[PDB]
Design a protein around this ligand. Structure first.
Ligand code: ATP
Ligand code: ATP
Ligand code: ATP
Ligand code: ADP
Ligand code: ADP
Ligand code: ADP
Lengths: 372, 712, 541
């Protein structure tokens, strides 16, 4: 139950290098962190249909096929898809949105036809339709004939694919509503996965993954950086590390003679990233994920707020019991209440109460500020 | 005497059927004679007659292979006729089944078929199967091709060709759709309506010649997506037995310019030259949408070609066109008129019995555990379409596999046999799947059925009698109205305090006549007002007409009747046939704010005041609501009824919910302390302490004054 | 199939006569126009609600004339490959020209030459230009007549409605009782009807049904009969018993069921219809009856006197008074007396036109009125529009009318003061007429009229009820009688279930009237009378 598949390289000093223990693809599960639940869901929905197809025969069900990942850009959807495909080690046909859209008229559909036909021929296969929105935007966005021919061809191929063939289709799109609504029905991209911005632990994992090759100085406190960085998606963290390294080299440029093509080996080997460089990079960087609504976790307990004991008890009775003990609610047959409305003077800490409620049920927190 | 009971044949012959001696005399047959046996749907074969005295009168023996071929089980009935004209197959090609030739070496022909065809004279027919036991194994073979056709005898003169690809067993049903009426559940009236218009013109074409009429050709089905419309069309086509052709919408709209017309023309002519035939056009709205949507030249030429082809077949008979869409107002209006989809059929979400039937149909291959209460699921799952039910079953199975994943490993390409032997889904998995389900049919107006009688409506019995007079008599006994020449009143209006039992009242009124029920809540009215909804008032009334009789309930009518929406509603009401039993029932809390135009005669004129429930009504409500909750023995609700003066039904429900919440809180606290299966009186006292009326006295007196003024 | 001669059409004497006298003579007897030296009109434009038999009429006329015929469908012509539609049109026209005499039927012309607004595409412009060029170039050609069928006259491009083009216009209106009876007889000339058939009753009951709707009704009734007799039919048997097959026969109840399961739609939009109400369904108002007779009948029946004196008959009239006084019935009777068609435009239709969500338009309404002249246009509850774009369009159309043409606009409204004064000016709806509530004798006459189709207990005098209904509008008495009938049917059903009640009784009337009310408040009546006297003082020297 839950994340049950995660428990237990890339199907592969000289021996360690050969066994993997510019184009360094085949990034395994190690190269991803901070998205354990979503990765578990994707693995559960991808591997078992292909790796172990006899279970479904034994139980007698038709496994779902369409999988639709969506989340803020830069969270690593493509990375997750590629990692899963390489781990499964099956015929992997990759299709991009703009890449197909850039073809001449009448050739952006034959490519899809041949792609699906080949995937069927060499089953088991995994198809990753990256940036599916570009080839299937909202119905009102595109009125041109080609923009509907492509969508109709995609729908026909998807409907025809539903069969015994062990082929799974995965699509990625930042905006869940941007996709044509007709693509989200039974027999199509039904199962949906949401990617949210990582938390402090996720940020620490991402920073460790990226900051493994850099000549980090001893005075580095990656824990502090993870604590300070809030709302930074993985791409933002990678950019932060790159900017910090750039700042370090810029500081060391004093002893570097740009005129000479080569540099003294001692100077090249003396590069070291300092905490101040990371702080400067944080100052320069500018995240943009928070500009739009996103899913994130919170870790506020009933100690960062004061008083409101009766209010805390009321909120507990309202939310916790339905979540922790639905069995008794079913026993009494009473469905739990849906929503709650806090009112009072401004500045009393309603946001902290909401975050605490979310934390107690261990549920993700979505916010919609007034300007939104 | 061609109907005989099915029995399990002891022998191991797939082309031998045993009959009783008396039965053999009745059928006028001889031992060893070949006879043709036809079973369910359009499947039939030929079997060698055998004499069996042990067989009881009206009984026959057939092995499992014959039953599988005929799509029948033990104890079924078949039609048997003499088959003396069967000839000898001069040349037959037969190929083995793939799964039956797993690693079997040597000349399969000589090893298996040759002993099985040494002067056996076993009758064969196209598509038949037979299993031959050779050595310690058994191999199945299928009748791939025969000459002369169709059914003949495999004698020595026959030339057997056993060269060809193995016949994979999966593709027989995976790549082919063989679904009968038994695969459809919860929709019987719609199935009967489709059959009486599809089979009758084809199976019995001489009846219309005898009565000298031209039966309607077009048939337009519509309803919420996922209700099985395509499955219904497939089942009807298969049961009819006539040649079936499918014209998928997006498939025909996803080809180079000038070729979609070619595909449509080819399909129509091919259907024409194979009369009788069925043409099914799935997702018609994709190729022929409303004018405001499609403006390009190609998307209009396609529609023009479709109209031309459809109008070109009204002379030729034995062909019927069946469409499919989600909304009636989602296709070009020119397609809905005489000669083009005259008949309209509406499919709505199923009821409890339909949901149970769907669950039984889907959960006939799953390995369910003993502790399953499918009836309980059907009761709980409301608003779920068949697709949602299938998704629920798949999710439950996935949850079961996930739970069993602890005892298995992700390595290897095989799983331990014992682990696979233990796959059993339990009720917890179904509840979890329900938790993770995402029903969407209710997001838009749909037609459903209700099962409320004069049982859950306490008080206001005079209103019950008035509704009876208004509704029941016109529908059940129109003869009296015709005798007096009185057109029955169309609709009714309800006004009064909110939460006094109006929705369930309308549901009960619809139930009495046994008619479908459509609901249009306030938010839907606002969405249609802003024109950001996918449905329009005209669409609602067209669906109501299609599913007639129906009751259209307009909740919170004052939110929009304070305009475009009111004008559209009034026009639709006026353009309503008198004889059709389509009743419009409106509800509101501000009868003054309602536009007077609606209240005119021939419209929502009969105003009815819904008074606050009386003490007896309050007692009835309390008894009804707690009908499914453990109550403390000896509880007296008369005191609550007395003390709950001025409380609406919603208020009583709130009090009961709060009492149950306190009781469950105490129970869970006690359990965590480590008992409380009853809801004590003190719980009701606790709920009362913090409960009060939600209806102001000012509003009550204003409603009373308005009712008195209307009475005066 | 073909050979659908004049015997396959009924209830359309006027339109068939017009089309015949316009088509046959140019083709059958071309020498007449040589002798009199005129140029017979070529273009013809038939338009009306769908399913009224336009194509059937055209085919019947062509077959009876016995001339070369060519059929053109808008859809198929528009469904060809780009650049093929023009070729097909050129072919068709050349073939028709070469085989003179000839007839061309451009069915669904609006689908190939739509309103200019919806002609954004290039191909539409090309096709329209090709059609216009072909038509204009046909003037040199002779012995060729073009007929076009369109849903409404405002849908085709305006350029197609000039001299030398589809100038002659014909309007197809819904049929009346006699037409529906004739259609029923025509369709039911082969069905194995049972002896107990009352086709006349069906015709009387079915109002507003078009020929197509009647055909569908017959098919549905036959289907119901087959379904009912199916109990003796098993789907298993391939062979059908001869006795069972012969036993089939439709009955009246089958037709009633089919009527129950029918969906007419002609009345959904404004359509020219015929009415046959005389000076009997309305009682009292004798002065108003005589005034309307003088106003309308004399200009129509005796134009010679007006020509002698040069008077121009008034165009329209306006009725004001309490609602439910029978204004619509009075207008229908007025139309009946002059033997002119009737067009009704209810208030919701006017609001829809205001909001521009309705296909029809004021200009279209008046074009149909002209094509169906003489006619009586009826604008109900003008107050809802005269609280304006709609008012301006109406005024322009009303001013732009031929005096000789017998088109009269009759307005009804309960708020004469709120009506825009511009409408009351001379040459418009200036003749106001007050419609008071019925008198005692009027009430008795109304009661008798509404009871001509209901059995009654002998000796049931209605004078007491008439006297006890002072100031009650016709709708009030209708409500009272309907309530009495409702109580009678209630008692009859109760007795039947307990088992009697074959006719109404005075006690039922007493029970129904015990809960009656006056639909018009006294204050409204006072205001109406004050306004009437004020207007009287405006013309009461
Ligand atoms: N666990 C991780 N989560 C998020 N980003 C990660 C993670 N590990 C590494 N990254 C880095 O984050 C960036 C993710 O790039 P990627 O192309 O996957 O993003 P995306 O927005 O999902 O892509 P797409 O263009 O396909 O929509 C890369 O720099 C990758 O190196
Ligand atoms: N009686 C039933 N009603 C509804 N669904 C059913 C029924 N019996 C089986 N099903 C299952 O419900 C699903 C219906 O899928 P299907 O695509 O045929 O429906 P649909 O809504 O008619 O389709 P579409 O409009 O996309 O052509 C299938 O899983 C079918 O097996
Ligand atoms: N007198 C009649 N008037 C009208 N319809 C009749 C009459 N007699 C029979 N019918 C039947 O009514 C139907 C009229 O359909 P028809 O196609 O003629 O109508 P339409 O709207 O003019 O056609 P279209 O727009 O397709 O050219 C046909 O079934 C015709 O057989
Ligand atoms: N118990 C508390 N009562 C009032 N304010 C608090 C409490 N705990 C924290 N805060 C402060 O309140 C601020 C946010 O106030 P909050 O009420 O959540 O938002 P808003 O002021 O918009 O309603 C934070 O900066 C936080 O430091
Ligand atoms: N006959 C009844 N009269 C009043 N309330 C009832 C009756 N029967 C049950 N109730 C309860 O009272 C509630 C009142 O709300 P409801 O009738 O659903 O809303 P509304 O009256 O606005 O249509 C019902 O939901 C139900 O729980
Ligand atoms: N002489 C009459 N005076 C008043 N009403 C009559 C008369 N004769 C018949 N009626 C009734 O009047 C009704 C028509 O009402 P109408 O005047 O059209 O309402 P409105 O005033 O809203 O137009 C018909 O149902 C008819 O039964």
């Amino acid at each position: 139950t839950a994340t049950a598949i995660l428990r237990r390289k890339k199907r592969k000093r000289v021996v360690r290098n050969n066994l993997r223990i510019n184009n360094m693809n085949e990034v395994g599960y190690d190269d991803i962190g901070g998205c354990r639940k979503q990765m578990a869901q994707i693995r559960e929905m991808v591997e078992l249909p292909l790796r172990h197809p006899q279970l479904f025969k034994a139980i007698g069900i038709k496994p779902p096929r369409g999988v639709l990942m969506y989340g803020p850009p830069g969270t690593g959807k493509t990375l997750m898809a590629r990692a899963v495909a390489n781990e499964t080690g099956a015929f992997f046909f990759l299709i991009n949105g703009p890449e197909v859209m850039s073809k001449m008229a009448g050739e952006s559909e034959s490519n899809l036809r041949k792609a699906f036909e080949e995937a069927e021929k060499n089953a088991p296969a995994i198809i990753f339709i990256d940036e599916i929105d570009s080839i299937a935007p909202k119905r009102d966005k595109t009125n041109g004939e080609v923009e509907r021919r492509v969508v109709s061809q995609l729908l026909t191929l998807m409907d025809g694919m539903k069969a015994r063939s062990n082929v799974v289709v995965i699509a990625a799109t930042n905006r869940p509503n941007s996709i044509d609504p007709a693509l989200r029905r039974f027999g199509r991209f039904d199962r949906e996965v949401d990617i949210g911005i990582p938390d402090a632990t996720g940020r620490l994992e991402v920073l460790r993954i990226h900051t493994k090759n850099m000549k980090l100085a001893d005075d580095v406190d990656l824990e502090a950086l993870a604590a300070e960085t809030h709302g930074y998606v993985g791409a933002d963290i990678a950019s932060l590390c790159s900017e910090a390294a750039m700042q370090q080299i810029r500081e060391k440029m004093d002893l570097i003679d740009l005129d000479e093509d080569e540099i003294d080996a001692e100077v090249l080997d003396s590069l070291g990233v300092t905490m101040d460089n990371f702080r400067f990079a944080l100052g320069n960087s500018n995240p943009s994920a928070l500009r739009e609504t996103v899913v994130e976790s919170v870790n506020v307990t009933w100690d960062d707020v004061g008083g409101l004991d009766e209010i805390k008890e009321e909120l507990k009775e309202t939310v916790e019991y339905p979540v922790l003990h639905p069995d008794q609610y079913t026993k009494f047959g009473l469905s739990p209440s849906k929503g709650v409305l806090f009112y009072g003077p401004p500045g009393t800490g309603k946001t902290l109460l909401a975050k605490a409620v979310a934390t107690e049920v261990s549920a993700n927190f979505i916010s919609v500020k007034g300007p939104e | 005497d061609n109907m005989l009971l099915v029995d399990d044949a002891i022998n191991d012959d797939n082309s031998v059927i045993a009959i009783n001696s008396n039965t053999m005399d009745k059928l006028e047959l001889f031992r060893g004679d070949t006879v043709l046996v036809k079973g369910k749907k359009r499947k039939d074969t030929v079997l060698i007659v055998l004499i069996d005295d042990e067989l009881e009168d009206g009984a026959c023996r057939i092995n499992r292979v014959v039953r599988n071929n005929l799509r029948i089980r033990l104890g079924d009935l078949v039609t048997i006729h003499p088959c003396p004209d069967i000839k000898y197959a001069t040349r037959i090609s037969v190929l083995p089944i793939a799964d039956t030739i797993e690693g079997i070496t040597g000349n399969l022909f000589d090893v298996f078929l040759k002993p099985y065809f040494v002067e056996a004279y076993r009758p064969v027919r196209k598509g038949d199967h037979f299993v031959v036991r050779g050595g310690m194994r058994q191999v199945e073979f299928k009748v791939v091709d025969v000459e002369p056709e169709e059914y003949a005898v495999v004698a020595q003169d026959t030339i057997i060709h056993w060269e060809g690809e193995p016949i994979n067993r999966e593709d027989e049903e995976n790549n082919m759709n063989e679904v009968g009426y038994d695969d459809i559940g919860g929709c019987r009236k719609q199935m009967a309506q489709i059959r009486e218009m599809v089979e009758l013109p084809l199976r019995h074409p001489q009846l219309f010649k005898a009565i000298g009429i031209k039966p309607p050709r077009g048939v337009l089905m519509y309803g919420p997506p996922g209700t099985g419309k395509t499955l219904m069309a497939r089942a009807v086509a298969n049961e009819t037995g006539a040649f079936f052709f499918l014209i998928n919408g997006p498939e025909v709209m996803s080809k180079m310019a000038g070729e979609s017309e070619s595909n449509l023309r080819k399909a129509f002519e091919e259907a024409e030259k194979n009369a009788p035939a069925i043409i099914f056009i799935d997702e018609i709205d994709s190729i022929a949408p409303k004018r405001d949507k499609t403006n390009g030249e190609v998307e209009r030429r396609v529609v023009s070609q479709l109209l031309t082809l459809m109008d070109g077949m009204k002379a030729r008979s034995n062909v019927v066109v069946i469409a499919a869409t989600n909304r009636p107002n989602s296709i070009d209006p020119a397609l809905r008129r005489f000669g083009r989809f005259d008949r309209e059929v509406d499919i709505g979400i199923p009821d409890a019995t339909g949901r149970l039937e769907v669950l039984r149909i889907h959960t006939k291959n799953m390995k369910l555990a003993d502790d399953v209460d499918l009836e309980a699921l059907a009761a709980e799952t409301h608003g779920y379409v068949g697709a949602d039910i299938a998704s629920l079953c798949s999710e439950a199975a996935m949850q079961q596999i996930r739970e069993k994943m602890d005892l298995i490993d992700l390595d290897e390409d095989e799983i331990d046999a014992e682990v696979l032997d233990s796959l059993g889904v339990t009720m917890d998995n179904f509840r979890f799947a329900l938790g993770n389900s995402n029903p969407s049919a209710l997001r838009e107006t749909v037609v459903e059925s209700v099962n409320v009688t004069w049982d859950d409506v306490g008080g206001l019995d005079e209103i019950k009698e008035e509704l009876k007079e208004t509704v029941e008599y016109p529908v059940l006994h129109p003869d009296q109205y015709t005798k007096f020449g009185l057109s029955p009143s169309k609709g009714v209006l309800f006004y009064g305090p909110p939460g006094t039992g109006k929705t369930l009242l309308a549901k009960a009124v619809a139930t009495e006549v046994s008619a479908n029920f459509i609901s249009v809540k306030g938010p839907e009215l606002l969405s249609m007002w802003y024109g950001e909804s996918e449905s329009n008032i005209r669409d609602i009334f067209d669906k109501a007409r299609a599913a007639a009789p129906t009751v259209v309930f307009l909740d919170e009518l004052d939110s929009i009747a304070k305009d475009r929406v009111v004008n559209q509603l009034l026009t639709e009401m006026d353009g309503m046939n008198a004889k059709k039993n389509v009743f419009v029932i409106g509800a509101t809390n501000r009868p003054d704010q309602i536009d007077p135009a609606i209240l005119r005669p021939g419209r929502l004129d009969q105003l009815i005041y819904v008074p606050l429930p009386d003490e007896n009504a309050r007692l009835s409500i309390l008894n009804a609501q707690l009908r499914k909750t453990p109550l403390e023995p000896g509880l007296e609700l008369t005191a609550i009824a007395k003390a709950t003066q001025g409380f609406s039904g919603a208020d009583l429900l709130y009090i009961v919910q709060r009492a149950a919440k306190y009781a469950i809180k105490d129970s869970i606290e006690a359990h965590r302390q480590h008992p409380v299966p009853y809801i004590t009186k003190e719980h009701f006292a606790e709920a009362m302490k913090t409960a009060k009326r939600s209806v102001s006295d000012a509003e009550l007196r204003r409603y009373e004054a308005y009712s008195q003024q209307m009475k005066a």
